[PDB]
Structures are given as C-alpha cells and as structure tokens.
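User: Predict the complex with 4-hydroxytamoxifen.
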Amino acid sequence: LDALSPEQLVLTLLEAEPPHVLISRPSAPFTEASMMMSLTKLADKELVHMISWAKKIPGFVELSLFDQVRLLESSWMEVLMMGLMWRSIDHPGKLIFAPDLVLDRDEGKSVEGILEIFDMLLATTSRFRELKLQHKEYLCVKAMILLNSSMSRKLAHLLNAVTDALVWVIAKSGISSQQQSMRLANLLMLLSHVRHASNKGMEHLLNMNVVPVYDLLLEMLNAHVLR
Amino acid sequence: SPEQLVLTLLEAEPPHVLISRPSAPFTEASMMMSLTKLADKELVHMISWAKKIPGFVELSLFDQVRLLESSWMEVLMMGLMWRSIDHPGKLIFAPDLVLDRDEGKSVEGILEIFDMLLATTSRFRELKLQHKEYLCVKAMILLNSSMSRKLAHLLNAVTDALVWVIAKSGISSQQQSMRLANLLMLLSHVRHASNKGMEHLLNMNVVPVYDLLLEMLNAHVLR
Ligand SMILES: CC/C(=C(\c1ccc(O)cc1)c1ccc(OCCN(C)C)cc1)c1ccccc1
Ligand SMILES: CC/C(=C(\c1ccc(O)cc1)c1ccc(OCCN(C)C)cc1)c1ccccc1
Ligand SMILES: CC/C(=C(\c1ccc(O)cc1)c1ccc(OCCN(C)C)cc1)c1ccccc1
Ligand SMILES: CC/C(=C(\c1ccc(O)cc1)c1ccc(OCCN(C)C)cc1)c1ccccc1
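Assistant: Here is the predicted structure with 4-hydroxytamoxifen placed in the model:
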C-alpha cells in the first residue's frame, strides 16, 4: 500500500530512470538513410532500456505478462517522444536525441516527411516549457503514459496511484487550489498531443506484413486462455 | 464565468441528425454511405455550434478553421460516445441508425475502430460522465486540437468551467482531482480513435503545402 504512496512512488520513479543513451552523427552530411539509421539504432537501445524501467515501477511486475507486453507495445513511441521532449525542454528549437545528436528543425529535412513530426515534438516541448514542467511531474506523466496506454483491479489501481502521486507533487508547490486543478488539467491535456505525435510518428515509420490476429485474440480472451 | 459558459454550451448544442438504414442488407458501400451522409450533416451543424462558443468568433478566421479542421473527427466521436453511453455494446449514430459491434463487419476494418469507441464509451459510462461534464469536454476537444492570447484564454475558461462542474458534486477534493485526471486521460483515447478513423477513412492527392504555410506565417501574410 505504502510502496505505492505519493512520496514512495515518486522516490521509486526518481531512481528508475533509464540510463542515457549515447550516439554520434556519421561521417558524410545526413541523408534520409543515415538519419533514420542513427535514430533507429538510438530508438532500439532506449527500448531495451524502457523494459527495465517499466519493471521498476511499483507493481508493474505483478500485472499479467500479457498486460505488461500490451501496455509497452501500445505506448512505446509516446514514452520515447516524452523522454525526448523532456530533455529538449530547455533548448527551444532543438531536439536532443543524444549529447552528440542535437538536431534542430531544418536538419530533419534529411528524412522526407519527418519535418511535420519534428514540429509537433518541438511545439509540445514548448508547451511543457511554458508550464515549467518539473522533473517530478515529468516522472509521473511518463509512467501514466505507460499505464494509460490501453483500455482491471490491479491496472486501474496502479494507474490511480501514479495519478495520486502527480496531484501530490503539484500540491507541494504551494499554488492555490484552483491553480492546482488548472495545472493538472493543462498537463494532462498535453497527453492528447503526445499520443497524436506518436500516432503520426508510427504512421510515418510504418511507411518506411503479418497475419491479422485481432479477432483471434478476442476469441482467446473470451475463452480465457490468453497468458 | 463557469455557470455562464455551461449555460451557453448547453443551449449551443447541435440538433440531432436523423438518418435511416437502407433497404437490402448493409454492404461495405451502403454502410459507409450512411455514416458519411450522417457525418457531413453533423459537420455542417458543428460549424454553427463552434460559432456559439463564447469567444470563438473572435479568433482569427484562420484559427477557427484550423481548430475545426484538426478536431472534427474527435468532436464527432465524442458526440457519438455520449449518446451511446446508456446503450452498452451499441453505437447510437442516430435514433434510426443504431449498430451493434458485429454489424460493423459490413465495412472491412472499422471493427477495431468500433471497439475503440465502445470501450471509451464504456470508460465514460463507468465514470458516470455527466451531461455538463460532457459539454465542457467537447469544446475542450475542439479548443485543444492544435498546437495564443485569446486561444489559451478561451481554452482555460472551459477548463475552469469543467473543474467547476466537478465541484458541485460534493465529493472530497482528492476525488475531484481524481475525476478531472480520469476524464482528461480519456482524451488521449478519443484523439487516438480519431487518428485511427482518419487512417481508415483515408484508405477508402494534392500538393504538399506544409512548408509554404510556414513561410506564409513567417512572412506574416496568412489570413
Ligand atoms: C520522432 C523521431 C523518431 C524516433 C525517436 C524518438 C525519440 C527517441 O528518444 C529516439 C528515437 C524513432 C526512430 C525509429 C524508430 O524505429 C525503431 C524500430 N524498432 C522498434 C524495431 C522509433 C522511433 C522518428 C519516428 C518516426 C519516423 C522518423 C523518426
Ligand atoms: C516493438 C514494440 C514492443 C513489443 C512487441 C512487439 C511485437 C508484438 O507483436 C507484440 C509486442 C514488446 C513489449 C513487451 C515485451 O515484454 C516482455 C515481457 N516482460 C517481462 C517485459 C516484449 C516485446 C516493445 C519493445 C521494447 C519496449 C517497448 C515496447
Ligand atoms: C466511427 C465511425 C465513422 C464515422 C462517424 C462518427 C461519428 C458520427 O456521429 C457519424 C459518423 C465517419 C464516417 C465518414 C466520415 O467521412 C465523411 C467525409 N467527409 C469529410 C466529407 C467521417 C466519420 C467512421 C470513421 C472512419 C472509417 C469508417 C467509419
Ligand atoms: C473537413 C474539415 C473542415 C474544414 C477544412 C477542410 C480543408 C482544409 O484545407 C481546411 C479546413 C473547415 C473548417 C472550418 C470552416 O469554417 C469556415 C469559417 N467560419 C465561418 C467558421 C470551413 C471548413 C470541417 C468542416 C465542417 C466541420 C468541421 C471541420
């Protein structure tokens, strides 16, 4: 119960942060291939990392394996983009994928189409920047993205605890009540923009085949044999 | 003010659009023909609705268009979820056009889209979403679809109005905070459904103007 209390949860997420991933640009001037290559290599590394991070969130380990895989599968692009926005929050106009990989808007034009994605990331980052998004609020929101990715007893509980944690953090700020409700709303409403950039990103990534298993999974869940 | 805004959103509600099913057993075509007929009629009314929203008509004609342009599919799906809320397992497109999850199989693909809607509606049903709450959430979907002075002002006012609505409930503060988070967290699912629907709708050619639109804004000549 307590390991899931505002200060406890905040503490655990504070130290669950994945390790920073390093990567440096290539020799020649960026092309569409080299560009994506770097970002893919980079995205894959952080993903292996995103697993051990999820495992450290109070109780994630007790959710069925199917649900673990489900949430991570449904929310991984949003989690990446939020990690990316967060670390690019104090450097307006630039996306800090990694220390030696600090690309500004224009360089994205190396990979046809990513431009609109870069602007979405850049514009959402700005919103968090005006809000003066704090590291503690950030940690709660990232985890919330993980648990709010799809839609039980445990799941919802785990999610509401992360929610209670964020109210708590915003609460130790001193601002009145009406401004605590406002910040909560503003912060959460940016979740639509994150999800949206994720969908846009997925679509673009996909552009650059398996057997449909949607019905079968329902059948399986319905029969109750899924994991 | 909160009470004012609510009252104004209430009476700003679009009329209910009446449409009926066709003769023969729904075909992928006929099915999508009925939904498209319905949506366009609703979209027509949507403009009028957005115009009644306090302050909207003051935003440059460009922002108005941009907002409606980017949020219309969510607004629609939000309206659909609201009227299907008391009909589990069903999507109430109109009084005469109600479809079960299974009938959606008339149009190849929309099934996953129908499950997204029914499940979100399911979530709102479990939160016992209230009419006034719904009113605020809708305008909120319209006003938060894109990313100024008046804009944010307008958006924070509806947001104030929502907190206010949740406040006359009487639940403790911790619970009021909880409900605001749970409702707004549900926006991400609404936006997600919308993106999925757009992808599918699109599946069933113009010149890229994105870069040109930026320049035009940079040069400050856009509307
Ligand atoms: C938004 C930049 C980005 C990726 C990214 C975002 C944040 C971050 O911290 C690191 C990378 C990106 C690039 C590739 C990618 O594919 C990996 C394939 N794996 C899952 C096998 C995922 C995200 C991207 C997504 C779609 C198209 C083009 C670029
Ligand atoms: C590429 C998406 C994905 C998984 C996936 C890929 C294809 C598919 O058909 C279904 C899922 C994924 C998600 C979770 C996972 O967990 C292993 C079990 N627990 C103990 C971590 C493995 C792959 C994932 C990988 C790393 C981080 C976040 C998400
Ligand atoms: C969710 C069902 C739906 C539509 C809908 C939602 C709510 C509502 O109240 C009425 C209809 C839908 C159908 C067609 C559509 O395109 C119309 C073309 N216009 C833009 C000229 C938009 C939404 C739909 C969306 C994508 C693919 C197939 C069906
Ligand atoms: C189809 C999307 C759209 C508009 C649109 C289409 C293509 C494009 O390149 C840009 C926009 C749209 C939105 C608003 C609008 O309003 C007119 C200005 N005042 C009277 C509000 C006209 C078209 C729309 C129309 C009705 C309801 C909701 C959305």
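The beta strands of chain A are 94-98, 101-104.
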